[model samples]
Target chain A: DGGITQSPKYLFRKEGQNVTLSCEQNLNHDAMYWYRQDPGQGLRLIYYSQIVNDFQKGDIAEGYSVSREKKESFPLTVTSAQKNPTAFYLCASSIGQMNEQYFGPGTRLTVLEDLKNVFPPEVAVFEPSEAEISHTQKATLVCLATGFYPDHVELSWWVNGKEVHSGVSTDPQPLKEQPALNDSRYSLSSRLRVSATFWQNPRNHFRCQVQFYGLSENDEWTQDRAKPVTQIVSAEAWGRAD
Target chain B: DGGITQSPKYLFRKEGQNVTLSCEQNLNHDAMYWYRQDPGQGLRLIYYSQIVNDFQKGDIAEGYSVSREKKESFPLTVTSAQKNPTAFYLCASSIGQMNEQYFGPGTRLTVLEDLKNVFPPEVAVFEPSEAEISHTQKATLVCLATGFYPDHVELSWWVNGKEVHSGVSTDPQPLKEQPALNDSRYSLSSRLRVSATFWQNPRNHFRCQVQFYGLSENDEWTQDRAKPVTQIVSAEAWGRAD
Candidate 1:
């Protein structure tokens, strides 16, 4: 928190989409810079500014824009997304005359041709434990969908082949909090609450379904394969709902 | 010669001296840049210009100037020399819209506080061979002073403790033409021609002495140890004089 920090640690933009990367340094450094790092090729400067409102271009400044309105912040903008622009962007800040820079965790950007490249999520269902069900005379089941791309996903709960919304709660947005940036996928989860007696009954059956919506090259919304997990009775906590 | 070329491949300057590194490219590139490479810090841009007369400053542009009056030439000048300015300066040119850059053999510069740090030359003397001395009926001895700094060395031929001017031909400028740029020292050589009978005289003593003049901290000229090579008769070519 005391050093430079970048937002949206992982980003994916479609071709022609404009994206801006944000950087902030709490070290109170006067000089801040934006650079892109690629394999084989070392870190190259995009832009930098020592004073507020005064910016200078680096070796690779074409198709890039930078702003330094505040001494603590520097943002880089790419007007149009292209595959050539896909690389890890780093934000750094340094004191005057030291020539030593403190770098933040880089933001990885990937420019995709179409939404069809969006990856499907893997679904896993969790059944209530007997001890947990006996504590409150109630059962709670969790459904998690992980490792998905494009961020548009929905989780639904079904009872005996019929969709149900009661006693269900789902995360509003997909989480993109992976520690490592190599994988640019997102994750989502939902919870369903039911009575202990209802969960114990062998006649009762429950399922969790996860659906992914992605954009296609034709400018239309497309859907990938649906992943579902079913609850199993008298079994371990982890299960797959159909 | 067909690509990028840099002049003054090796340079040494005292503090506050102004020095310029020149670069020329025959590739007909639209963009030319100046960068200084240091160990651990990598390459840092000093200035670059894609169009003639229009130059852009890079991350490390302080105390530096650039000129691009001609499309094929780009020169970078440090207004005042300092220890921090000592590094390998690189010149690069590239075509438009392509990220590939062609780099020239870099110019190595050393900024020193005084002449005390100037490296002394190593001297080697070559005696005339029997066949060569017999063919010409006259002997030519070579005195080579190499690996010296500042390029202000003078080679003189001395016989019997007396300095002689005749038959002495020394290179006008100290040669800095080492294939590798790692060593920034210069070399100078002088040839002394004399009759074979005079060179074969056992009692005659011939020596070549090299003196180096360097700039001191007080702005006065200073001299280092004189390196002299002696001619050995009826023996191998290599010899060192007192």
Candidate 2:
């Protein structure tokens, strides 16, 4: 009813072998997507099909190829298996831009190797223009962080040292073999936007934190905090009221 | 390099207990989404936020609630956990619609239950209308299927007894819990659409096959296939002059 499906619910392949993952849908939706999730890496887009017979590259499409046959099925092939690669591959489809997406159950793959390295995680905060702020405009905030190995890390926000209760979102991390770095890494990224009137008062502190698994012996947590990056604009320069 | 991170990668919860998952991103994107993936089912959309502090109901938003305070973080709360409600919850974000989306490593939940009855799988096929045939001068095919429990399934299109290799798309099957039923029964639905333009003739037959996990034998696979659906368009409709 929503979008599409992928075949071979589970597959196990030896290193240096080939694996093909198939996806199909009945909604006649135009867009199809493929993503890989690893232990610590998070979810990364690999391949996407925009139209029938048309395929475009996503951020991680390098090692993957997709085929669209008959507007209802898109199959992804992993050319070669790597020893350090172990993760789940998910398939999804959408009708068009900004539409809701449907995802498959995901095929989990595992490789045996000794590779250790994680991507560093970071977060972003968006600041509204001064004019917008003067009128009590709402601002959107986003944070992106990667790079925790083995241990899972969480990204969260705190208002004045109090945890902000909001909806949290996450995707499966995709693990891949990176020859350039000579290590396997798990990576994932997410974004959330909040609209609130901005107050120039320095007492108002907005912070983003990443809590890792047992990273502290005393059950303490590690976190990162930063003030909203601000810009100064004169009212006369923009021809606005003071 | 990208944005998004989730914490407490793995969580253990009891039935009737409460758990909260957290998500954070730094991409400065405005939209965030939460999805749940079960063993035999595709990813189901639960909730999404477009603006800070804004929430939207997805196809399946019941049993879950979300909050967004700052732009950088969103948290989802599972108000009440049920024995039949274990699945992987994922968080994702997009800068806008149609752009690539980033996902976080998912949190897996397991439910303890007794006497979980598996349901028989079913499939349905929909044919394209004559108007569509005349306008595109080709046959169009659509297929829909569902009804598997506790396992995932995949849909594929086979043409002329051979799997079609072009213009294929797919999405996760959307599911709805049937409260009317005495037991907790869930219905999973999947659809497939194919345009006949790519085929040489309208006589070509297409089949939609769903592969699912068998209850009795986890390793054994049971598949249900829809009868071949053919597309026929009148020659006159193809602009042929007799």
Candidate 3:
């Protein structure tokens, strides 16, 4: 991993010396290892963590892992990061023997840092789009939401604050409402319409709110959807992008 | 009344014909979904699942398209099918339904069923041959599983309810064996070890689960986790399973 390297170029700690060097930035990268060199020896891993905390111990030292409740992340969403983002990586190595028990200027270390998430995903209406129904005198409208924290996002239309649960086709009750996040920002969408007979009077109200997310660093941002971000579905060319 | 409705309730079609089925719900729930249920299996996930469409790939939805126009209606359109397929289809609206779904009479679907190319993974566990902390003093447990097709499966562990990342001495080894194309079956093993001291508590239980992807025998649902097999690291393992 590019995130792993060394510092302090050289060291002169004799026997029984403990050395500690700091490293960070590359948690989301590939496999990296720690090693030691003395004139001409091979690199040895003291320990290593791969994949999703796939850590293995090597010779010497202890790897005490502490799960982070504060592990930061960009967000579970569809909006591209100011661009887009991934994880950071880091690693390290040590020197000295059972005798010195630490870094040897000759000892090496690899390290990395991963961006758990700096912010809970930002959520907003993706495209409040609509179209006329095929044959009915009614209209079909899309309560599209994009860039909402996901995995559990929800969308609902309210007729004056009264939640309207739409009819089903094939989806089960809860199974139909799983949250989705594509790319960086999370997104959710819902659809609706009213009987032409009920709309006989022009006295109707329609408001759609998407409730998304969980816990901290992943909670739905309520209120302040003033500047609704909109995405236009490409009719011609576009695979995916920022 | 939270009346939910579907269109084209009864229809007959030959293979390769494109059919569209529409549904409308006045309940206006936040989410709308689709699903496909086979003769025996429960309603399998359709929307955002393996089915192909704006959502993710779903098992039986390769040739289906679903459209949700606003919160009031969701319509499913079959892109093509010449084969005779029949299964009951249902729609659900679950907002004020006390989380209890109100499902409409299901549609009997008749799609093309080709057993030649689809099959679920055949799985069995090796039932770990007892863990041992050899006199040399390192604890080890190896889990073996086999009889799956297509050769690729991911193995993971759970130390109780918490997921445990298997400590690999090296990159994961591919399946242990492979067979001819017709019966393409496989086997694999994952071993976990720690200094004997790590096994001090026999109370801690460990379970191994395997994940694989393959079409089901009429199901095609990928990633069916075999019943997790466990290995108990007895406080003393001179002869555990006997």
Candidate 4:
């Protein structure tokens, strides 16, 4: 979560315009490039530009711009942006030809059309099962988001107040539906693991929040959250044989 | 890392001594027990004492003691501890008999013999391989400690200054030796995972420290450490296309 920095972490742009994504690494590695990543797919090479007065091309390079004006900076421009060009832009740098590559956080480029139809999702969270907690000393909390349009929602877990960053995994290819019923809504699930030592406290509250990236009623993006769950153990019945 | 707390995290004693390990859970559960975990063996139930004015006995409770005077605290006493009784003492509590149990960190009991012979381990750390880095954006660092007697060493990973708790794995059954050569030394390895974004900076440093739990020259415990490694990327050859 350090060393490399990416600017404009989230960019919302309309179709048919030029959008530039910037990445900078303070370590100054020998190789740097820009890549495109789509949901349900691995990273695909887009373009590579070196700062030694040299340049290299990637797989899909048409209507794209690459600049390496400084040793520590790499900027990528997508010219004539369209719906197909809307994806996550990733920048990476390495020491050798392709050795020990370091990645920036990433820039999410949302290329929207003129339409403004959006539907928020419903959220549900489930507690860990007895078998699961018994086998492993950890508790696994599951959060499911269903019936959402656009399929561009991000799920995050928060405990007490601060958001959790580690021990969290979400569906990579989150878009799925029943086409036979003509249902355009999608569903996805995100999981967060917590050690029993931390989750057994009644003061700890676990909540799942989903942020939808579409036109909103509040002038920005609309977000929804599920009811927080807290663990409670009765002190009166303490140590009473069940 | 909260809720449940263990007292006397470390206990050092000579042969034929009595040691008491205490555990307390803020969230008062109905069931509680104490268990013994060896270097290679899984958790073996030692004793289970309920606070319902009724008690349950475990498999191996001879010469062992347990008390549940208070609903929130559970303590285990090992009477006349010897070299064979040296192990890790764990305490766990649950709402139902064995459902959704939460565990304390643990207490380390070091029962010793009359002899004072111990050997310290040598440590070495290796950087992540190129293929490993390319396959996953994570950099896996390996730390190995070898040629140690008594087989009682703990390995920990540190980045910059803070000690990493998660993303670390150590060998469980670490004791091994060459019986034919009349040698009784042990060896083990620990691995730490780091995201490329955090490890690429020249300012960051990765260190592996090994703590040996035996008589020390400085009077407490002897410790060994690997030379800290820092990532170095030349800025002069900035991005030269190979």
Candidate 5:
């Protein structure tokens, strides 16, 4: 979640009016100009340009300007990104004819603006039946929540009125948003490791809390269905049966 | 996953020829001349072409003969797909060399190619838990069967002609199953723990074996195991440390 800004490594644009800077490896060039743009494959060229943006023989100049050698990088920080650049990326290459350069598979460069709207998350709390539980074993409780926006959610475990922090692991993964088909929304989960004694004791109220946003209030959800479908043979019960 | 899609998408061909790639943008700007990228942890400057035509030498070689047409379309034809000069292309128009020079998506142009089918894994075993002298300690042995396909299998160990009742503990856990990206195959690992005393005296040699599934548990068993991927370690040798 600590990453996400602007990437100019590849050719990417959102349309509207992008402010793109270009650079190269050699730094010295007889001439440098823009080329055509394509819109197929994810590498849709950002329209086209023919302007001689820079011309340097050996030395260089900088003032929101650009460069050229084998190739150059343009800081792709644009405002109110247009449809042409959103998740696109810019890739440069070198040593070829005129202003023509070859490109490799450039991943992605994105500028995700603020969320004008937020979608509340739907949280689900449960103890995965897959846990191995016993007097000598510890179990993991999974709390999953999906369908949310801005991907800002706070999660914690509550035992009765007290908050539990021992053996807790929260995934720091950014809001997982499916590509192309889905956008803006995110999903993730957290885990709480507890002793068998805590889970078996019915008096203990184990809950999961999900904080959505500033204005949105937090909600606490406790285990609904008793114990999971996993079977447990108590010593005393088995002794009595025998 | 990067957002943009490279058109003509997957292109598989023989020895050589040049391919042209293009670019565009939405955060429209007055300047830009650049190279290309590879941005995951972070994006970096590679190379790209400008609108005008001209050249010199650079660090990376020119894989193809490129032609800069229109302002947006800079088609860099491999001119020779013969491995020596075969690659994707790029074209862009942006603000400058510093600011994020946004980009579109990108694709691949593989020259030399090879296709290999997956083989049954080469299984190996090692004790994960250290041997202990006290009654309170238990030693765990991990079986790593890597480089297999179809992703399904069953595992068991034979103590000479006999079996251990605790085989239930050897059921492969979820984390053991792993999938790799480059290959359409899979790899996984599972663990089996026993008291040090149980294995310290190896009256019977303990060997681990794996069996991949066919359709049903009916066709599933040791007798039908493929490649059988069997490897073993002696208790006496493993119990000692150099």
Candidate 6:
């Protein structure tokens, strides 16, 4: 094909079996990249090749190595496959500088049971207080907290102290974890969105909640703040623009 | 515990049906995005939400739509499905431009047979003979040949009739077949790594080629004109620079 192709569309390997996945692009792009997608988790950048022989580490490049022998080919090697490393491996290539990137069909890997959950921890939940507003303005509240590992977390809004069924948005901050310092905490921001008109009814209140996965029970947390009013006010007027 | 969550880890839908994928993040990022990945293809930007009630179209936003009512969640909708749309769809969240983005485990979709290949015709090849080598050390060659539709294509390089296989290097240009234009051709480019090393003995002859799939006949094309040595005479030295 003219775009990109990945071989071994389906793979079955033992826990300790050596595995190598191949990725090729006819586009002759300047950058080729790889990512690993795990169940219940997002796709994490594993490796990227800026030019021939250039290798850069992403957030989770510890267990993977990549080779780009030609302009059209980039292959990844699974140095020592563990059971916990089983996931869908994806290959992508881009021209340069935030341009659109093409991806290949992913390769699925299943490691032995022993290596499973090697990084399994608990996730904490943080909630905001309840807030009510008058009938004609916007209702806005936010949740902010720190102290987490892997820097992976999610936040949302809840209605009447229940999980808010409305659409939610998230913004994760740059990860600053130092192994030498033993600083495992990461920060994130979440917002509760509701129309000022909808929140104008004082009887109605919305709650903001946070959910953290892959952490120990002691590391999990949640909070729900409260705000009540009869009318909605412009956030700009209150200097609460976020 | 408190970042983002996307449900329906995987989904399967038939053609002409509707599918909705949900994404929620606690990072409080102002923007959320949806992307689609076809097997062995690039990630196509579909939709993005900067803030509540704000929606923007990405490069490949056709056939997809999004909703971001609450700050904590963003949802994508595929009104009617087609077989050719069978691929993996991913979601991401970011705070601003050029910021690191967090991706979600993509949802794989497979359409029914009837809706297969619903997209417009595509052009797979473009081979142009005449190229301009600028005094600024920029050499541009374009291939102008078309056809080989209904499949994907890629461009590659063959130096001195031998495949140039070296270290991991920069990505080639991504060639996409424009649907509105009803052309199946895609375009890609290769740039010289060492700008100063142009047209030197033992490293002079270079060829560009295109490789494509889903074509009825031979799917490879090469440039016809092979340029011989064109070197600049030095004032003092007789031998080329080492």
Supply every candidate's count of residue pairs whose N, Cα or C atoms clash at under 3 angstroms: 8, 78, 78, 0, 112, 104
Better of 4 and 6 by DockQ: 4
Q: Quote the positional error of residue B36 for candidate 5 in Å.
A: 72
Stretches of model 1 off by over 4 angstroms after superposition: A1-242, B81-85, B116-120, B125-147, B150-242
TM-score of 6: 0.26
Choose 4 or 5, whichever is better by lDDT.
4
Best-fitting candidate, measured by TM-score?
4
- Error at A87, model 4, angstroms: 30
Worst 10 residues of 5 chain B by lDDT: B228-237
Candidate 4 residues A1-242, lDDT tens each?
A: 34665533445455786655656676868688788886766797787755555568777776787777666767777777434646888988888485788887776776755334345567888877666667785677888887765566667765532346666899985675776663467788888876544444322345676655443121333235321111111000001011
- Which regions of candidate 4 are displaced past 4 Å? A1-242, B1-3, B7-13, B37-44, B52-56, B81-88, B96-99, B105-110, B126-142, B160-172, B175-183, B191-200, B214-242
lDDT of 5 by residue, A148-234 (tens): 654545566654322457657888864666755545577778887654433443222345666443111111123352211111110
**DockQ per model, Cα:** 0.00, 0.02, 0.02, 0.02, 0.01, 0.01
lDDT of each model, Cα atoms only? Answer: 0.65, 0.52, 0.37, 0.60, 0.39, 0.49
- Isolated chain B TM-score per model: 0.54, 0.44, 0.38, 0.62, 0.36, 0.44
Candidate 2 vs 4: which has more lDDT: 4
TM-score of chain A of 1: 0.53
Query: Which stretches of candidate 2 lie above 4 Å from their native place?
Result: A1-3, A81-84, A111-242, B1-242
Off by over 4 Å in 5: A1-117, A128-131, A180-184, A214-242, B1-242
Question: Which model, 1 or 4, shows the larger DockQ?
Answer: 4
lDDT of 5 by residue, B1-242 (tens): 21111122113233542333323233343332333333332333234443345322234334544433333333334435234322342334455545555554343444433313324555787754442435445456667666664444456653321233453255443222433454555556656665444333222134455544212111123343343221111121122221
Clashes of 6: 104
Candidate 5 DockQ category?
Answer: incorrect
lDDT of 6 by residue, A1-242 (tens): 25665533334344555455667676879899999986666888899988888889888787677776567767776766434545788999999658988888666654433222222122233322234344324455565545443333344554422345454566755244454563444555556665443333222334443333231111212323221101111111111211
Q: TM-scores across all candidates?
A: 0.30, 0.27, 0.26, 0.40, 0.23, 0.26
Q: What is the Cα-based TM-score of model 3?
A: 0.26
Error at B113, model 2, angstroms: 38
